[PDB]
mmCIF file of C-alpha atoms in Angstrom:
data_model
loop_
_atom_site.group_PDB
_atom_site.id
_atom_site.type_symbol
_atom_site.label_atom_id
_atom_site.label_comp_id
_atom_site.label_asym_id
_atom_site.label_seq_id
_atom_site.Cartn_x
_atom_site.Cartn_y
_atom_site.Cartn_z
ATOM 1 C CA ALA A 1 0.000 0.000 0.000
ATOM 2 C CA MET A 2 1.133 3.547 -0.574
ATOM 3 C CA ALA A 3 2.894 5.175 2.367
ATOM 4 C CA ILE A 4 1.432 8.671 2.783
ATOM 5 C CA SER A 5 3.101 10.999 5.262
ATOM 6 C CA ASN A 6 1.132 11.732 8.480
ATOM 7 C CA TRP A 7 1.697 15.456 7.921
ATOM 8 C CA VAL A 8 -0.507 15.325 4.820
ATOM 9 C CA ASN A 9 -3.348 14.092 7.037
ATOM 10 C CA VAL A 10 -2.402 16.697 9.621
ATOM 11 C CA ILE A 11 -2.768 19.386 6.964
ATOM 12 C CA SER A 12 -6.240 18.101 5.992
ATOM 13 C CA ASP A 13 -7.365 17.963 9.673
ATOM 14 C CA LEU A 14 -6.238 21.580 10.001
ATOM 15 C CA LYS A 15 -8.367 22.447 7.000
ATOM 16 C CA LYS A 16 -11.242 20.518 8.562
ATOM 17 C CA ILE A 17 -10.907 22.420 11.837
ATOM 18 C CA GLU A 18 -10.867 25.753 9.866
ATOM 19 C CA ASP A 19 -14.216 24.811 8.254
ATOM 20 C CA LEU A 20 -15.788 23.484 11.428
ATOM 21 C CA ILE A 21 -15.013 26.636 13.545
ATOM 22 C CA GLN A 22 -16.503 29.025 10.974
ATOM 23 C CA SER A 23 -19.981 28.435 12.430
ATOM 24 C CA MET A 24 -18.740 28.914 15.969
ATOM 25 C CA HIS A 25 -17.299 31.783 17.882
ATOM 26 C CA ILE A 26 -13.905 30.807 19.231
ATOM 27 C CA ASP A 27 -12.187 33.992 20.219
ATOM 28 C CA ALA A 28 -9.078 32.727 21.953
ATOM 29 C CA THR A 29 -5.710 34.192 21.094
ATOM 30 C CA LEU A 30 -2.966 31.628 20.838
ATOM 31 C CA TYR A 31 0.840 31.551 20.914
ATOM 32 C CA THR A 32 1.875 31.552 17.291
ATOM 33 C CA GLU A 33 5.329 31.218 15.764
ATOM 34 C CA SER A 34 4.814 32.745 12.334
ATOM 35 C CA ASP A 35 8.387 32.187 11.179
ATOM 36 C CA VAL A 36 9.902 29.001 12.467
ATOM 37 C CA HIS A 37 13.643 28.612 12.205
ATOM 38 C CA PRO A 38 14.606 25.101 11.087
ATOM 39 C CA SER A 39 16.858 24.851 14.128
ATOM 40 C CA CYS A 40 13.808 25.226 16.471
ATOM 41 C CA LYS A 41 11.057 23.509 14.477
ATOM 42 C CA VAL A 42 10.232 20.675 16.877
ATOM 43 C CA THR A 43 9.993 23.128 19.782
ATOM 44 C CA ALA A 44 7.628 25.237 17.662
ATOM 45 C CA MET A 45 5.580 22.239 16.527
ATOM 46 C CA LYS A 46 5.075 21.281 20.142
ATOM 47 C CA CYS A 47 3.652 24.776 20.899
ATOM 48 C CA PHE A 48 1.257 24.596 17.978
ATOM 49 C CA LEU A 49 0.063 21.224 19.191
ATOM 50 C CA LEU A 50 -0.471 22.417 22.762
ATOM 51 C CA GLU A 51 -2.421 25.488 21.586
ATOM 52 C CA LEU A 52 -4.589 23.454 19.223
ATOM 53 C CA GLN A 53 -5.864 21.778 22.383
ATOM 54 C CA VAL A 54 -7.167 25.098 23.660
ATOM 55 C CA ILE A 55 -9.248 25.447 20.401
ATOM 56 C CA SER A 56 -10.535 21.965 21.023
ATOM 57 C CA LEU A 57 -11.372 22.550 24.724
ATOM 58 C CA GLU A 58 -12.988 25.930 24.143
ATOM 59 C CA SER A 59 -15.061 24.520 21.262
ATOM 60 C CA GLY A 60 -17.217 22.220 23.379
ATOM 61 C CA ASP A 61 -17.660 20.306 20.035
ATOM 62 C CA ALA A 62 -17.436 16.493 19.365
ATOM 63 C CA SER A 63 -16.225 16.739 15.772
ATOM 64 C CA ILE A 64 -13.590 19.341 16.656
ATOM 65 C CA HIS A 65 -12.232 17.346 19.539
ATOM 66 C CA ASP A 66 -12.200 14.175 17.441
ATOM 67 C CA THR A 67 -10.330 15.993 14.659
ATOM 68 C CA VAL A 68 -7.852 17.612 17.019
ATOM 69 C CA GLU A 69 -7.254 14.180 18.763
ATOM 70 C CA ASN A 70 -6.566 12.588 15.366
ATOM 71 C CA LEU A 71 -4.277 15.356 14.304
ATOM 72 C CA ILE A 72 -2.104 15.189 17.445
ATOM 73 C CA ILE A 73 -2.025 11.403 17.328
ATOM 74 C CA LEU A 74 -0.733 11.723 13.734
ATOM 75 C CA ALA A 75 1.822 14.408 14.683
ATOM 76 C CA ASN A 76 3.272 12.575 17.725
ATOM 77 C CA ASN A 77 3.666 9.494 15.485
ATOM 78 C CA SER A 78 5.807 11.374 12.992
ATOM 79 C CA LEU A 79 7.703 13.148 15.750
ATOM 80 C CA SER A 80 8.742 9.782 17.295
ATOM 81 C CA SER A 81 10.599 8.617 14.223
ATOM 82 C CA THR A 82 17.599 18.149 21.114
ATOM 83 C CA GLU A 83 17.120 21.793 20.190
ATOM 84 C CA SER A 84 18.686 24.269 22.618
ATOM 85 C CA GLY A 85 17.950 27.953 23.245
ATOM 86 C CA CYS A 86 14.599 28.079 21.471
ATOM 87 C CA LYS A 87 11.877 30.364 22.858
ATOM 88 C CA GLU A 88 9.428 28.947 25.330
ATOM 89 C CA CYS A 89 5.834 28.836 23.918
ATOM 90 C CA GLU A 90 4.821 31.736 26.184
ATOM 91 C CA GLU A 91 7.479 33.965 24.566
ATOM 92 C CA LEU A 92 5.514 33.883 21.340
ATOM 93 C CA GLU A 93 3.191 36.529 19.925
ATOM 94 C CA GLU A 94 -0.474 35.757 20.417
ATOM 95 C CA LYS A 95 -2.719 35.772 17.386
ATOM 96 C CA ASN A 96 -6.320 34.988 16.487
ATOM 97 C CA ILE A 97 -7.394 31.551 15.410
ATOM 98 C CA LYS A 98 -7.314 32.245 11.705
ATOM 99 C CA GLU A 99 -3.640 33.360 11.728
ATOM 100 C CA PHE A 100 -2.826 30.622 14.182
ATOM 101 C CA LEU A 101 -4.108 27.887 11.800
ATOM 102 C CA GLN A 102 -2.479 29.491 8.774
ATOM 103 C CA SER A 103 0.873 29.444 10.563
ATOM 104 C CA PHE A 104 0.212 25.858 11.690
ATOM 105 C CA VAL A 105 -0.089 24.861 8.052
ATOM 106 C CA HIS A 106 3.168 26.695 7.369
ATOM 107 C CA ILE A 107 5.185 24.709 9.964
ATOM 108 C CA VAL A 108 3.613 21.454 8.808
ATOM 109 C CA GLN A 109 4.940 22.154 5.298
ATOM 110 C CA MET A 110 8.429 22.179 6.928
ATOM 111 C CA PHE A 111 7.981 18.630 8.197
ATOM 112 C CA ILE A 112 6.780 17.215 4.814
ATOM 113 C CA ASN A 113 9.594 15.722 2.648
ATOM 114 C CA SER B 1 -33.520 35.045 34.960
ATOM 115 C CA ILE B 2 -30.744 32.954 36.588
ATOM 116 C CA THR B 3 -27.335 34.673 37.041
ATOM 117 C CA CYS B 4 -23.939 33.509 38.390
ATOM 118 C CA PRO B 5 -22.203 34.701 41.642
ATOM 119 C CA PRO B 6 -18.810 36.440 41.596
ATOM 120 C CA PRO B 7 -16.283 34.090 40.109
ATOM 121 C CA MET B 8 -13.716 32.266 42.141
ATOM 122 C CA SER B 9 -10.098 33.347 42.123
ATOM 123 C CA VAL B 10 -7.438 31.754 39.822
ATOM 124 C CA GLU B 11 -3.838 31.989 41.176
ATOM 125 C CA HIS B 12 -1.879 34.928 39.602
ATOM 126 C CA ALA B 13 -4.858 36.022 37.471
ATOM 127 C CA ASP B 14 -7.699 38.419 37.614
ATOM 128 C CA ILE B 15 -11.089 38.674 35.962
ATOM 129 C CA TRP B 16 -13.611 41.373 35.056
ATOM 130 C CA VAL B 17 -17.058 39.932 34.259
ATOM 131 C CA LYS B 18 -19.008 41.631 31.477
ATOM 132 C CA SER B 19 -22.135 39.567 32.108
ATOM 133 C CA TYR B 20 -23.356 37.380 34.993
ATOM 134 C CA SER B 21 -26.080 36.044 32.737
ATOM 135 C CA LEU B 22 -26.563 32.288 32.059
ATOM 136 C CA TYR B 23 -24.075 30.824 29.474
ATOM 137 C CA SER B 24 -22.083 33.990 29.554
ATOM 138 C CA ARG B 25 -18.483 33.467 28.440
ATOM 139 C CA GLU B 26 -15.692 35.297 30.235
ATOM 140 C CA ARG B 27 -11.871 35.095 30.575
ATOM 141 C CA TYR B 28 -9.291 35.203 33.384
ATOM 142 C CA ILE B 29 -6.138 37.169 32.551
ATOM 143 C CA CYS B 30 -2.756 36.415 34.079
ATOM 144 C CA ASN B 31 -1.263 39.141 36.266
ATOM 145 C CA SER B 32 1.688 41.244 35.293
ATOM 146 C CA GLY B 33 4.856 39.115 35.153
ATOM 147 C CA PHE B 34 2.856 35.949 34.496
ATOM 148 C CA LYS B 35 1.755 34.292 31.216
ATOM 149 C CA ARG B 36 -0.979 31.771 30.364
ATOM 150 C CA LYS B 37 0.604 28.305 30.130
ATOM 151 C CA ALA B 38 0.515 27.064 26.530
ATOM 152 C CA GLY B 39 -2.266 24.551 26.110
ATOM 153 C CA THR B 40 -4.261 25.914 29.056
ATOM 154 C CA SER B 41 -7.479 27.937 28.475
ATOM 155 C CA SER B 42 -8.562 31.183 30.262
ATOM 156 C CA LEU B 43 -12.268 30.657 29.378
ATOM 157 C CA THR B 44 -14.881 30.321 32.061
ATOM 158 C CA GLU B 45 -18.621 30.070 31.486
ATOM 159 C CA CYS B 46 -21.659 30.516 33.661
ATOM 160 C CA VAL B 47 -23.430 27.160 33.692
ATOM 161 C CA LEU B 48 -26.439 25.601 35.226
ATOM 162 C CA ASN B 49 -26.687 22.860 37.747
ATOM 163 C CA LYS B 50 -29.775 21.334 35.978
ATOM 164 C CA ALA B 51 -31.422 19.651 38.976
ATOM 165 C CA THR B 52 -30.556 22.638 41.256
ATOM 166 C CA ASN B 53 -31.530 25.790 39.228
ATOM 167 C CA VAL B 54 -28.291 27.239 40.589
ATOM 168 C CA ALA B 55 -25.574 28.540 38.256
ATOM 169 C CA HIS B 56 -21.792 28.670 38.746
ATOM 170 C CA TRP B 57 -18.675 29.642 36.773
ATOM 171 C CA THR B 58 -16.772 26.681 35.261
ATOM 172 C CA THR B 59 -13.152 26.302 36.509
ATOM 173 C CA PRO B 60 -10.722 27.196 33.712
ATOM 174 C CA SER B 61 -7.738 24.958 32.940
ATOM 175 C CA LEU B 62 -5.689 28.184 32.940
ATOM 176 C CA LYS B 63 -2.394 28.047 34.688
ATOM 177 C CA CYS B 64 -0.423 31.237 35.038
ATOM 178 C CA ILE B 65 3.324 30.743 34.899
ATOM 179 C CA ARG B 66 6.153 33.151 35.512
ATOM 180 C CA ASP B 67 6.882 34.944 32.257
ATOM 181 C CA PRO B 68 9.771 32.914 30.667
ATOM 182 C CA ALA B 69 11.064 36.159 29.112
ATOM 183 C CA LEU B 70 11.916 37.336 32.647
ATOM 184 C CA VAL B 71 12.840 33.993 34.274
ATOM 185 C CA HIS B 72 16.227 34.492 32.619
ATOM 186 C CA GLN B 73 17.020 38.006 33.918
ATOM 187 C CA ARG B 74 16.581 36.781 37.511
#
């Protein structure tokens, strides 16, 4: 069977989340690394993943939680198969959900081969 | 016509409530020198104990941590 990278499925879960939240009113601001240096990418990916969970929690929605759960399962998988002096997540700029998810796609493109 | 009481305190955070009305959504904000822990939520909501007709604010998962920006200059 064809091996398809987990990050592809991560990208389409992000798109799914974008569509699902359009009907809702999530107004959280989230730590967002808009320009990830390659040298800190795993640190940054971990922040994105943590902050996606806030979107999930605040949603109170089954489909969103299920999509988020599937996304982070997929991500942790890939990340299984040391960066020093990277910013903590709380050092990042906070942005709205739309910019957050756009930047999440951007980092995911870095992990695709 | 149900409304919520003053919200409970969250360590290192404060809150100003725009509406005490049922299902109102509000947010705790970490004090100066503290930051919301990534992956924790500041949202609280006024919800109903169904078989009590009494409303309360949900506990947020928020955790306020020392600002990492500062933790390095002392």
